[PDB]
A paper describes a structure:
DNA ligases are essential enzymes in DNA replication and repair, catalyzing the formation of phosphodiester bonds between adjacent 5′P and 3′OH ends in the backbone of double-stranded DNA. The two domains are connected by a flexible linker which allows their reorientation to encircle and engage the DNA substrate during catalysis.
Bsp-lig is extremely effective in nick-sealing assays with higher specific activity than the canonical bacterial Lig E Ame-lig, and similar activity to T4 DNA ligase in the lower enzyme concentration range. The concave face of the OB-domain positioned in the minor groove and the ligated strand positioned over the active site of the NT domain. Covalently adenylated Bsp-lig was co-crystalized in complex with nicked DNA substrate, however the electron density maps show that a significant proportion has been ligated by the enzyme, and the linear sealed form is modeled in the active site of the resulting structure (inset). Covalently-bound AMP was refined in the active site of the structure with an occupancy of 0.6, however only two of the three phosphate atoms could be accurately placed and the third phosphate was omitted from the model. The latch region of Bsp-lig is positioned in the major groove across the ligation site and its complementary nucleotides, making kissing contacts with the NT domain. This arrangement is overall similar to the conformation of ChlV-lig bound to DNA, and differs from the bacterial Lig E which lack the latch region.
Numbering used by the authors: 2 to 94, 99 to 111, 117 to 138, 143 to 252, 258 to 318
The structure:
DNA sequence: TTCCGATAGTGGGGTCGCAAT
DNA sequence: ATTGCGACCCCACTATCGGAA
């Protein structure tokens, strides 16, 4: 059950696409749940054992075969990640583990050589389950394109990029390294302010997690409100334009200065329009990952 | 000089587990 | 049996520091 001194490998957002320094392997980003097997016990993105019992009894069967196989769990792929998560519960089954990397220990292995062991043939013996995330070889900018579209058209959220001989990084990869890059696209939109919430400072005791990430609790007993803006309660704004759809909050994309000033004059913000961006192409109700850009009409 | 790699501290959505009523 | 909160999943972003470019 022993890791070593390891923290899972995390992709980097795709920016500066000219330094994407080529031959690489492109794979589709599945919205499952990150999972890593170590010594017969399945771990999560934060190294916290998977709660579901069937997947854990599944582990150590075999520890030697399911050792260090870094992957992501799901159930009923392209539809939704919501159901891909009755694996955090302590019952109710068919998780189809997908594997897309393996961890040796700690120069070191490259992905060419690492994505060589992952082709573990569990099938001939047992054949319960397990799939290998398909990797596509790409040589030029045109190949990432012409493929991200196929992934998107098939229903995946995004595309992942891996350097052919990148080393396993126990941390978050960077663009100059090129170890792991994710390609997920934002889409702009408009909204009208309808309410406010103030920012909340968390004063609970600070704790280290397994990966050394400083973590505090959300007990709400130590949440003491600052005098800044925390989030904007808004609705979609779209010859009447007017507002449509349910109410959703936008709590990210503000500078420290904007949060202070906007809260001081929040009364004047009701009824003024803002641009925001989000994911899941379309004006779908209940947007996801909303980010505030600016006001439709500055000053 | 400027960049950036890493951390900390805010925020969004969602499903489960569990104590409390 | 229901409620209600908090942990935990998937994230995004800004601010900051000190070493790297
Ligand atoms: N083929 C893939 N390669 C790398 N990561 C993937 C893949 N499919 C899904 N993912 C997930 O994408 C996450 C990284 O995105 P995030 O960090 O913005 C990882 O935690 C993985 O669980």
């Amino acid at each position: 059950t022993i890791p070593t001194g390891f923290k899972p490998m995390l992709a980097a957002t795709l920016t500066k696409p000219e330094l994407i320094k080529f031959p690489v392997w492109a794979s589709p980003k599945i919205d499952g749940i990150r999972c890593v097997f170590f010594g017969g016990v399945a771990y999560s993105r934060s190294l916290k054992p998977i709660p579901n019992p069937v997947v854990q009894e599944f582990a150590a069967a075999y520890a030697s075969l399911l050792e260090g196989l870094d992957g992501e769990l799901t159930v009923g792929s392209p539809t939704d990640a919501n159901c891909m998560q009755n694996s955090m519960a302590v019952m109710s089954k068919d998780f189809t583990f997908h594997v897309f990397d393996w961890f040796p220990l700690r120069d070191e292995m490259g992905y060419d050589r690492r994505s060589e062991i992952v082709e573990r043939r569990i099938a001939d013996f047992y054949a319960r389950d397990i799939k290998a995330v398909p990797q596509h070889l790409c040589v030029c900018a045109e190949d990432l394109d012409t493929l991200e579209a196929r992934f998107l058209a098939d229903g995946y959220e995004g595309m992942m990029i891996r350097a052919h001989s990148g080393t396993y990084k126990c941390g978050r990869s960077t663009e100059r390294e090129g170890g792991l890059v994710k390609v997920k696209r934002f889409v702009d939109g408009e909204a009208v302010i309808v309410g406010f919430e103030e920012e909340m400072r968390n004063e609970n005791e600070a704790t280290r997690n397994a990966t050394g990430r400083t973590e505090r609790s959300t007990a709400q007993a130590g949440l003491v409100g600052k005098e800044t803006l925390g989030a904007l309660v808004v609705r979609r704004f779209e010859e009447p334009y007017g507002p449509v759809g349910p109410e959703f909050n936008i709590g990210t994309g503000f500078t420290a200065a904007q949060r202070r000033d906007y809260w001081q004059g929040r009364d004047g913000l009701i009824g003024r329009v803002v641009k925001f961006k989000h994911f899941d192409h379309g004006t779908v109700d209940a947007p996801r990952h909303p980010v505030f850009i600016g006001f439709r009409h500055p000053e």
